[PDB]
């Protein structure tokens, strides 16, 4: 049904979302929110219309979505990175780019004023950015050529040309890593599989949008791709995907995330084993692991993905892919734990308050809508609303808090050709109804209006479950925001 779950399932935190797809994520920490930034994946079919495996064609976009909570999140949309090849219709940032794999994020404080850079590769060939003024853009490409190619000093060995990670240093300095591939093309011998050398860390210069000096090779076993970097009690840990080729020892596991130590940014690093394992490890089959490591709100964790919606819908991964999150242990001596993977996932870490203007957009759990861009007045930027509802979908959030007192009202922002309801539901779907919001005919889907109705019996911590209804298809109505006002 749908109606159900797809693979998020109530009371669970992996996959993040399983609204659509994801791959390659990185967070950015910042102001008491986690920004997930991930590679835009999407369906590809053959002629017939069924699903065929994972090619990249449509990587050329960068999704993003938040969450002050870990359970709840806000989607934020897409953002048209790529440019070339007539790429997202004309409006892709980066003209220069027909692909924006693998996103990295920073955030550096220059001339008072907090600035965003984003990182991406234009598939195995270069590394660009874009800037921007807020975690969400809008974004400008202020070199439009890439920021590092295999002319770039230092560059010249690297096979991938691709996931950048980029960190901002404690003293401001940022720092660029990169790389991956074997060389040895089609059949590598058994070291260069063992010490590909095709990792590489270059300094970046004070505005983030060049680079200083020469890179250098960090000689890390059994290279493969996901270039990582975070810093824990003044060491650098640089974690990368181990390959999956040529006989490895035991504690460079194929396919899974190893990790090195440093007291510097740029090395030398020593190898120290391994965190992740595969997902198919935990999920099933396998694939690709790719992954970020960041401290939200006083504690580590790992983001990383998994063929975990793709294979619910489809009866196989294909190499479809979806952002989970776990949390991530160093231990006394420093070395890292096994990271549990799993389904469960991080319980929330604080409540939601519905007294505030919510996004519709900003969900734990849905059963079976879509988000889209929102052509509603005002809002946030790259506004979303939710669309494709018909009747009985819904979308739930987590552990609202409507306080000893509890509300009064519930308000809705929506659009809607023929109307149909929001009921207001605690605890489950079916849970205990508090209210009921009639959506009229609004004059058409792009024609908005704010609509308020009663609620009564909404007090203390709930899950809070809109259940949409109405008759006739295709969309019941677009949905924008909530609120909810305090008695
Ligand atoms: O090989 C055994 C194996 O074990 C199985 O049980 C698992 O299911 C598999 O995951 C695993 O196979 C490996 O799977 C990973 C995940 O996709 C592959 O890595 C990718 O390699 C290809 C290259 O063929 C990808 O696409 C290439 O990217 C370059 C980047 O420059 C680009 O030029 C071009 O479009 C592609 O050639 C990705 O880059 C990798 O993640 C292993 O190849 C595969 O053996
Ligand atoms: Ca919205
Ligand atoms: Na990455
Ligand atoms: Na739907």
Redesign the pocket.
Known sequence: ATSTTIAKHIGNSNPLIDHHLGADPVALTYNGRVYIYMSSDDYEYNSNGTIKDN??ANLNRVFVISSADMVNWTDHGAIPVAGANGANGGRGIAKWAGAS?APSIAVKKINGKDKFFLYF?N???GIGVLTADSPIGPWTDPIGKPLVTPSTPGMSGV????DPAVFVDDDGTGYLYAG??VPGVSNPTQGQWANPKTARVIKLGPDMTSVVGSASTIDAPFM???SGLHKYNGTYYYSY?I???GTHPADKP??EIGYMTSSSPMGPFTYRGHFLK?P?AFFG??????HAVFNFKNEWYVVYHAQTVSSALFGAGK?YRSPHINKLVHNADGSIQEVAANYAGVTQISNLNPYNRVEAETFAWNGRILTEKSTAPGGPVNNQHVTSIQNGDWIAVGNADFGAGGARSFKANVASTLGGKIEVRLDSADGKLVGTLNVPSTGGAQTWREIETAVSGATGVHKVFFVFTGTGTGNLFNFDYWQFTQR
């Open positions: 090619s990249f794999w590769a598939s195995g060939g096979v991938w040309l691709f991956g591939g493969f791709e996901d995907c390959n999956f080729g194929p396919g595969n198919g089959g396998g694939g690709n692991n790719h190499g």
